[PDB]
Specification:
The chain has 270 residues and is mostly helical. It has one domain (1-270): Retinoid X Receptor, CATH 1.10.565. Helix content is 64%, strand content 5%. The protein has helices at residues 6-23, 28-35, 50-59, 70-94, 104-123, 143-147, 154-168, 174-185, 196-217, 224-252, 260-267, and strands at residues 45-47, 127-128, 131-134, 139-142. The protein has a 4-stranded mixed beta sheet. Strand 2 and strand 3 form a beta hairpin. It is globular and about 65 Å long. It starts with 5 loop residues before the first helix and ends with a helix. Bound molecules: ligand GW0. Ligand GW0 binds next to helix 4 and helix 7. One of its GO terms (cellular component) is nucleoplasm. Belongs to the nuclear hormone receptor family. NR1 subfamily. It is found in: Nucleus.
């Protein structure tokens, strides 16, 4: 038959975890070691105002468009970060069993409508209630500083903190997140898919693997699997809202540029 047993699902999970470790430089384990002070290096440089942002741009190890103003500059660094994670997600996807065998067009479609949900999920790993890590972990920008940016740029990031804090309360590790992100990517609900049943099948397999994985890895947790399915739904709404805010910037901040790679992702949604 075609219905995988527990042993098959466990092996499937291990392969996805390996593809994860292979393709992501900033894992939650690494991020947490930095954020909890376990790292052997000194605490990250803190960006909490204009003076420190300027200093970080001069002393922190990171081709942006010409400087215009603080809020727009930060907007550009958001884009750059996003582009890098998109490249990692693409390589991660290619390494997930049964992704590379989908129609090329379906692979493209899945990444296009999937990357942002995945980005916001993984973002939680490098975030706490007070800020997030930048410059590959060597910097830390405060939530308060991002709130100080002028509208509409301040309105973009705050929603992600709200989501991340609650998401982090679930206490997932990298092994869990590997399956979660795979499930987000291999999503049979995306528009323009040629072979929906194939994608549906793969997603369901990933989800079953995830349930069994959570059982062993978090034996004492309650309703963790259902909670994560809800998180997936929450991410869809987060992205819709984020895309709306990006469109507003596109129409009102005509002096602000958008990376071509991100332009295509958002191309056919407005
Ligand atoms: C505008 C925008 C915001 C987000 S919210 C998640 C954030 S915040 C962030 C960041 C914030 C401040 C700095 C600073 F100050 F420079 F240190 C920094 F380096 C990095 N990086 C990310 C991923 C996500 C995407 C996006 O546009 C691109 C798209 O939608 O594709």
């Amino acid at each position: 038959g075609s219905h995988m047993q527990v042993a098959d699902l466990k092996a499937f999970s291990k392969h996805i975890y390996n593809a994860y470790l292979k393709n992501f430089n900033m894992t939650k384990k690494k991020a947490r070691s930095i954020l909890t002070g376990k790292a052997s290096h000194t605490a990250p440089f803190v960006i909490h105002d204009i003076e420190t942002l300027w200093q970080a741009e001069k002393g922190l190890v990171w081709g942006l468009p010409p400087y215009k103003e603080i809020s727009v500059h930060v907007f550009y660094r958001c884009q750059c970060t996003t582009v890098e994670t998109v490249r990692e997600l693409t390589e991660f996807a290619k390494s997930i069993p049964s992704f590379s065998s989908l129609f090329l067009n379906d692979q493209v479609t899945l990444l296009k409508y999937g990357v942002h949900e995945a980005i916001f999920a993984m973002l939680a790993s490098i975030v706490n209630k007070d800020g997030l890590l930048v410059a590959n972990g060597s910097g830390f920008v405060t939530r308060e500083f991002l709130r100080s940016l002028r509208k509409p740029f301040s309105d973009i990031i705050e929603p992600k903190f709200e989501f991340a804090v609650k998401f982090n309360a679930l206490e997932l590790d990298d092994s869990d997140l590997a399956l979660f992100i795979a499930a987000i990517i291999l999503c049979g609900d995306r528009p323009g898919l040629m072979n929906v049943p194939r994608v549906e099948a793969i997603q369901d397999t990933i989800l079953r693997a995830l349930e069994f994985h959570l059982q062993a890895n978090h034996p004492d947790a309650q309703y963790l699997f259902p909670k994560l399915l809800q998180k997936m739904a929450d991410l869809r709404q987060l992205v819709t809202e984020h895309a709306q805010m990006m469109q507003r910037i596109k129409k009102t901040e005509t002096e602000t540029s958008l990376h071509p790679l991100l332009q295509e992702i958002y191309k056919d949604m407005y």
